[PDB]
Design a protein around this ligand. Structure first.
Ligand SMILES: Cc1nc2cc(OCc3ccc4ccccc4n3)ccc2s1
Ligand code: NI
Ligand code: NI
Length: 330
């Protein structure tokens, strides 16, 4: 498809963006929701970046270019879209703050960028779909199909004229940050998560875990990328349930495509199977989210508010199964 260069009229306002006061305190929190501030996201990011690695961290004329160009390359799909990008990036920021001195500037800015870019050019179709129905990309990338494409897009965007914001770095620092990013994105493939989790859990429970160990570091950033990518399970109940609607909207659309070629899709992608959602969420929390956050608590205790919320949301889902489900406005 190629990459589309953003029009020059969008960054014309962003360079002038000043952050409202009341948010300056609110942003710092884990459960904070970007939702209500759509027209502020491009600034919310900048602010987070300026706070975590200083004002002169990037060439602001090119950072503003990089962002609004990334914004364009997210499709108007119902979930894996521009809003997801910022939501995830914010959770990174939040983690990074509560663990600031554990990471290099290179790492901090590297991650923040990777987060906003982790789902670039998402078509609203999973790995399973692209691999079971030989999409060109699956033979391009046998494993972690979409994630690899996400990376190449990020790369291509940087390579375009007036985009490279890591240019002010040494060719040694460039090789590393693009790698920190490479690994960061690839880890967001849930496939790799479970293995990664167990390892980290084993390592910790045996005191093996050391963050000066480049291999252990990779894995800790790994679980970070997973924690953030799924942080919708860490927001207050009502947001959690609305975001959930966005995901199924996208899931079912894919299911609509597997029906059009004689394969009954997994219940999760079948709009005719809504009844199974609350039980289906229980599973995902118990098998994935709780593990993800419990582990991350042990490794990084200041992240514990993420787990506190997730346990609450599971507690809410159990309460939905029992029939105590509360009001919703559709
Ligand atoms: C932010 C994300 N939420 C989820 C939830 C998932 O699970 C939802 C799920 C699971 C099993 C089901 C079985 C039947 C019906 C619906 C289901 N939904 C799977 C991946 C992600 S990423
Ligand atoms: Ni993804
Ligand atoms: Ni994602």
């Amino acid at each position: 498809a190629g990459t589309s260069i953003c029009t020059s009229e969008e960054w014309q306002g962003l360079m002038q963006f000043t952050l409202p006061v009341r948010l300056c305190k609110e942003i710092e929190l884990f459960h904070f929701d970007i939702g209500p501030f759509e027209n502020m996201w491009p600034g919310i990011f900048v602010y987070m970046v300026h706070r975590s690695c200083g004002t002169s961290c990037f060439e602001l004329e090119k950072l503003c270019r990089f962002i609004m160009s990334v914004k364009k390359n997210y499709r108007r799909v119902p979930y894996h879209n521009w809003k997801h990008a910022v939501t995830v990036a914010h959770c990174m920021y939040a983690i990074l703050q509560n663990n600031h001195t554990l990471f290099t500037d290179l790492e901090r800015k590297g991650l923040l960028i990777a987060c906003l870019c982790h789902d670039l050019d998402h078509r609203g179709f999973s790995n399973s779909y692209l691999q079971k129905f030989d999409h060109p990309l699956a033979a391009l990338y046998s494993t972690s199909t979409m994630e690899q494409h996400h990376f190449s897009q990020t790369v291509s965007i940087l390579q375009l004229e007036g985009h490279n914001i890591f240019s002010t770095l040494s060719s040694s620092e460039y090789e590393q940050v693009l790698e920190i990013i490479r690994k960061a994105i690839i880890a967001t493939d849930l496939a790799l998560y479970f293995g990664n989790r167990k390892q980290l859990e084993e390592m910790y429970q045996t005191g093996s875990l050391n963050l000066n160990n480049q291999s252990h570091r990779d894995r800790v950033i790994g679980l970070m990328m997973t924690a953030c990518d799924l942080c919708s399970v860490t927001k207050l109940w009502p947001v959690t349930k609305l975001t959930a609607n966005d995901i199924y909207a996208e899931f079912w659309a894919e299911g609509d495509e597997m029906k059009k070629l004689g394969i009954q899709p997994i219940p999760m992608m079948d709009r005719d199977k809504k009844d199974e959602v609350p039980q289906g969420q229980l599973g995902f929390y118990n098998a994935v989210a709780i593990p993800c956050y419990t582990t991350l608590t042990q490794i990084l205790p200041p992240t514990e508010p993420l787990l506190k919320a997730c346990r609450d949301n599971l507690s809410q889902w159990e309460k939905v199964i029992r029939g105590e489900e509360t009001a919703t406005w559709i």
